Design a protein around this ligand. Structure first.
Ligand SMILES: Nc1nc2c(ncn2[C@@H]2O[C@H](COP(=O)(O)OP(=O)(O)OP(=O)(O)O)[C@@H](O)[C@H]2O)c(=O)[nH]1
Ligand SMILES: Nc1nc2c(ncn2[C@@H]2O[C@H](COP(=O)(O)OP(=O)(O)O)[C@@H](O)[C@H]2O)c(=O)[nH]1
Ligand SMILES: [Mg+2]
Ligand SMILES: [Mg+2]
Lengths: 431, 47, 436
């Protein structure tokens, strides 16, 4: 178990992917040209996980950038770190997507996917022991959602002995690029249920909340949300990016966090809630960290855990701090709200500690949660969707691209079923 | 040997049944005369 | 006469590292394999040659081969301060680890390397002029240790019929625990190993934790700490095979002294004195005191109360500077003072042996270079507490068959659980019947 091959698709997926590579490239100590300049060896103990090793003391992101827009890659290259990417790993088309899933998954997308697969195979042949594949995309768009789900299918079928990992982002009525976001999202979930082992659900609406209310940014621009996404992703991958027995690789972490085949939808949690370029007049303690990162105000999905019981939790504390204080505080949070945890999974709340804290932050608290509260997300979509699917509105923009009306009902049904599954396992007892 | 699962089994078995009630049309929406853009309209008339 | 040791999984391999280090420190063997006394570049007849085979260069190579479906650990072996001891063929390194999955270690990744493992056992089982049997190290939670160990035991009562095979296991402590499914493996790697095992000791990591935190004052014990303890615990149960000793000199002798019935072969072991290298340092302890500490749950290796429980067999191995009649006196005082209830159909007399050599420890290690030491090997029914703290951590999950789909996905039927549960219930039942 070693290398992770990374992919990013769509406008949103490529933007937030760029920002994520900025983050971890700054943590580990990598410059926009690719040389290593850090002042710690722990940074390079597990550096191969996300980096090809190139001649000339360089470091290349083992990543693959996919879009059907032209201009997104332009915004990448002339971006800050756009020099480091091995140019053969750029793959993009010229048609566009139009926030149309069907276009991304059957037509204009299918005329580029084999060319993506050849670059994926070029990075997987120079691998030694490939772990799995990490994916980021939008679910409300056309490129990342459609072509993304396509890639997930063909890659998980080309190597089914490896891991499939996705960071999907939601449609938000408070952001809303279009009004077929429910459809795109619905189908993409229908794929993600049977296709992926892990899905870190970022909710665009939740991020609009955390920006407008907690951070008080009155007109949230897209980059504003992409900062919260970047922080979340940097945190959850700490287990994989630094020496740690707990959650050393994708397979381990997945086996610890996933007790049921379908239910692999994780509510992430970050603390403290930080704006861009803001001072820390009084950096948080340990009790304050643990108290916030389980509070609903710090959640990446627009859901309340005071309504849903956690099945598993992977908590990660970054920055040097008292380990005894950590264990104690975690015990506190667990057995003070034990009526909000499943007891039929003993010791289900694992915790790993890191020493190099995030950029600028002295201490942080990154939280992954397999919650039965995540259904509050689906039931939003599965309502948003149904309202339009009843009189079959906006269907000609997909059936006109060559799909089947039953492919939608398989999706809505599969989703309502995933929610009934979540509630079912919520009402579980010790009999 | 528990409950709760049982109400989930009742689900998991039906979803497959639904799948066959879709994988039926497909290879049975083939067979001999089974084409031309009016295929839906023809199947309508025939029924 | 000569025995062969075998190491499975992260825990097993590290434990092996420490244990062979201690063996060398006690016999007087240098890290490159030499020995001052020795016997002219290969004698093959000494007491300590039941475990070491000597070479023309006088290199006392241990009769052991190391195994991991994950090279990260065994590479710490071929890189450590003892890289010149073994031979790289005694080191087997897979690729994909079992990922704390029993089905990945028995079925999938196990079958893809077992043949090389047997292949490497063979070359060192040929140099055996007379093979007594095997000693195996592993864990209960780890994927490699739980799966590939059961595969090797199945394919070890085959290729070597029945001579002897003795087990060392590591019981899951939710303390330094890393996996949620550690019960699952732990049950299976027992249900599929109960029969191929002649004898089997256990190690509750929670007890080693409690002991390094109570008697050693290490608030946060790292892995090297706990391991450094468990080594000096093991090297007293096995010190009788490597020296010219009185008790426990054959691999089957353990089955005799300790095992009245082969299904029940899990002896509580207790070691005293456990004292730090900087702690107390007042007057050394007497023989009577270390003998008395053999019956304190604070010094037992599995968190169980032998008080509310019957004994079956009970040995006591002494080493250091001990007097016989003193031990006899302590034996009488304990025989009369306590309510140590023995079941009726067993010899309640306590067989004892000594080795008149100082119990050497790790120089600069976390423990004291103590003077006299005792290790009780008492099979007791109270050890049945341990399984109860797993089946309870088991029925909660099989009653929601969560985390089960991973085993199904890696080549194992759901009925193997349905039989592995009833099997354990049966063993627990036997542990009840011994008493009444
Ligand atoms: N005493 C002791 N126990 C350990 C140590 N490392 C792990 N364990 C225990 O062993 C169990 C995990 O087994 P491991 O041996 O680490 O895993 P593995 O056999 O290598 O299997 P894979 O990790 O999948 O390759 C856990 O329950 C731990 O409590 C150690 O260094 N010392
Ligand atoms: N966080 C974030 N979300 C975005 C961004 N751009 C678009 N989105 C969301 O993603 C969806 C649009 O998907 P997009 O990637 O633009 O379409 P695509 O090019 O076809 O993949 C909408 O629901 C938006 O709310 C962004 O920069 N950041
Ligand atoms: Mg686009
Ligand atoms: Mg391992």
């Amino acid at each position: 178990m070693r290398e992770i091959v990374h992919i990013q698709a769509g406008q949103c997926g490529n933007q937030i992917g760029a920002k994520f590579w900025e983050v971890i490239s700054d943590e580990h100590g990598i410059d926009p040209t690719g040389s290593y300049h850090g002042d710690s060896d722990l940074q390079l103990e597990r550096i191969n996980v996300y980096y090809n090793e190139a001649t000339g003391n360089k470091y290349v992101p083992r990543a693959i950038l996919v879009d059907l827009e032209p201009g997104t890659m332009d915004s990448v290259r002339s971006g800050p770190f756009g020099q480091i990417f091995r140019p053969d790993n750029f793959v993009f088309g010229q048609s566009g997507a139009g926030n149309n899933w069907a276009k991304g998954h059957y037509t204009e997308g299918a005329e580029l996917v084999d060319s993506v697969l050849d670059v994926v195979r070029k990075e997987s042949e120079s691998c030694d022991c490939l772990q799995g594949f990490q994916l980021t995309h939008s679910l409300g768009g056309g490129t990342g959602s459609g072509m993304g789900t396509l890639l997930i299918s063909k890659i998980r079928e080309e190597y089914p002995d490896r891991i499939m990992n996705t960071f999907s982002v939601m449609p938000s009525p408070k952001v809303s690029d279009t009004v077929v976001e429910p459809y795109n999202a619905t189908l993409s979930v229908h794929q993600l249920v049977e296709n992926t082992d892990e899905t870190y659900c970022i909710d665009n609406e939740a991020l609009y909340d955390i920006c407008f209310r907690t951070l008080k940014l009155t007109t949230p621009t897209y980059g504003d949300l992409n900062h919260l996404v970047s922080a979340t992703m940097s945190g959850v991958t700490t287990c994989l990016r630094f020496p740690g027995q707990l959650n050393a690789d994708l397979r381990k972490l997945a086996v610890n966090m996933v007790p049921f085949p379908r239910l692999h939808f994780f509510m992430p949690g970050f603390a403290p809630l930080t704006s861009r370029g803001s001072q820390q007049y009084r950096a948080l303690t340990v009790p304050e960290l643990t108290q916030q990162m389980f509070d609903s105000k710090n959640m990446m999905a627009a859901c309340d855990p005071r309504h849903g019981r956690y099945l598993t939790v992977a908590a990660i504390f970054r920055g040097r701090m008292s380990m005894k204080e950590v264990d104690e505080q975690m015990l506190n949070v667990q057995n003070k709200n034990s009526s909000y945890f499943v007891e039929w999974i003993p010791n289900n709340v694992k915790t790993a500690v890191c020493d190099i804290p995030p950029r600028g932050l002295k201490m942080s608290a990154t939280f992954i949660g397999n919650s039965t509260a995540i259904q509050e997300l689906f039931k939003r979509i599965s309502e948003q969707f149904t309202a339009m699917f009843r009189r079959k509105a906006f269907l000609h923009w997909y059936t006109g691209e060559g799909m089947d009306e039953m492919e939608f009902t398989e999706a809505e049904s599969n989703m309502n079923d995933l929610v009934s599954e979540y509630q079912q396992y919520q009402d579980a007892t010790a009999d | 040997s528990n409950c709760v699962k049982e109400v989930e089994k009742l689900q998991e078995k039906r979803e497959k049944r639904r799948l066959q009630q879709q994988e039926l049309r497909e290879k049975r929406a083939q067979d001999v005369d089974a084409t031309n853009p009016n295929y839906e309209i023809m199947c309508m008339i025939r029924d | 006469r000569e025995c062969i040791s075998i190491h499975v999984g992260q825990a097993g391999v590290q434990i092996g590292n420490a244990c062979w280090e201690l063996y060398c420190l006690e016999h007087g063997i240098q890290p490159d394999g030499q020995m001052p006394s020795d016997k002219t570049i290969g004698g093959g007849d000494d007491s300590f040659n039941t475990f070491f085979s000597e070479t023309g260069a006088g290199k006392h190579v241990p009769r052991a081969v190391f195994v991991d479906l994950e090279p990260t650990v065994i590479d710490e072996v071929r890189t450590g301060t003892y890289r010149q001891l073994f031979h790289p063929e005694q080191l087997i390194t897979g690729k994909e680890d079992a990922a704390n999955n029993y089905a990945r270690g028995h079925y999938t990744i196990g079958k893809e390397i077992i043949d090389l493992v047997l292949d490497r056992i063979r070359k060192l089982a040929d140099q055996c002029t007379g093979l007594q049997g095997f000693l195996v190290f592993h864990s209960f939670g780890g994927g490699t240790g739980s799966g590939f160990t059961s595969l090797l035991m199945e394919r070890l009562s085959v290729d070597y019929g029945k001579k002897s095979k003795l087990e060392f296991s590591i019981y899951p402590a939710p303390q330094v625990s890393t996996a949620v499914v550690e019960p699952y493996n732990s049950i299976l790697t027992t249900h599929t190993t109960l029969e191929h095992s002649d004898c089997a000791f256990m190690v509750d990591n929670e007890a080693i934790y409690d002991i390094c935190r109570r008697n050693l004052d290490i608030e946060r014990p790292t892995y090297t700490n706990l391991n450094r303890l468990i080594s000096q615990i093991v090297s007293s149960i096995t010190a009788s095979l490597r020296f010219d000793g009185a008790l426990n000199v054959d691999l089957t002798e353990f089955q005799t002294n300790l095992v009245p019935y082969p299904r029940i072969h899990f002896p509580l072991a207790t070691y005293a004195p456990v004292i730090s290298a900087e702690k107390a340092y007042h007057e050394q302890l007497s023989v009577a005191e270390i003998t008395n500490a053999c019956f304190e749950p604070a010094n037992q290796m599995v968190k169980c109360d032998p008080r509310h429980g019957k004994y079956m067999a009970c040995c006591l191995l002494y080493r250091g500077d001990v007097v016989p009649k003193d031990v006899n006196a302590a034996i009488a005082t304990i025989k009369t003072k306590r309510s140590i209830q023995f079941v009726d159909w067993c010899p309640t007399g306590f067989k004892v042996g000594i080795n008149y050599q100082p119990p050497t420890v790790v120089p600069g290690g976390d423990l004291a270079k103590v003077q006299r030491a005792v290790c009780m090997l008492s099979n007791t029914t109270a050890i049945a507490e341990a399984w109860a703290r797993l089946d309870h951590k088991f029925d909660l999950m099989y009653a929601k068959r969560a985390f089960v789909h991973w085993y199904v996905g890696e080549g194992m039927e759901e009925g193997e659980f349905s039989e592995a549960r009833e099997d354990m219930a049966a063993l627990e039942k036997d542990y009840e019947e011994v008493g009444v």
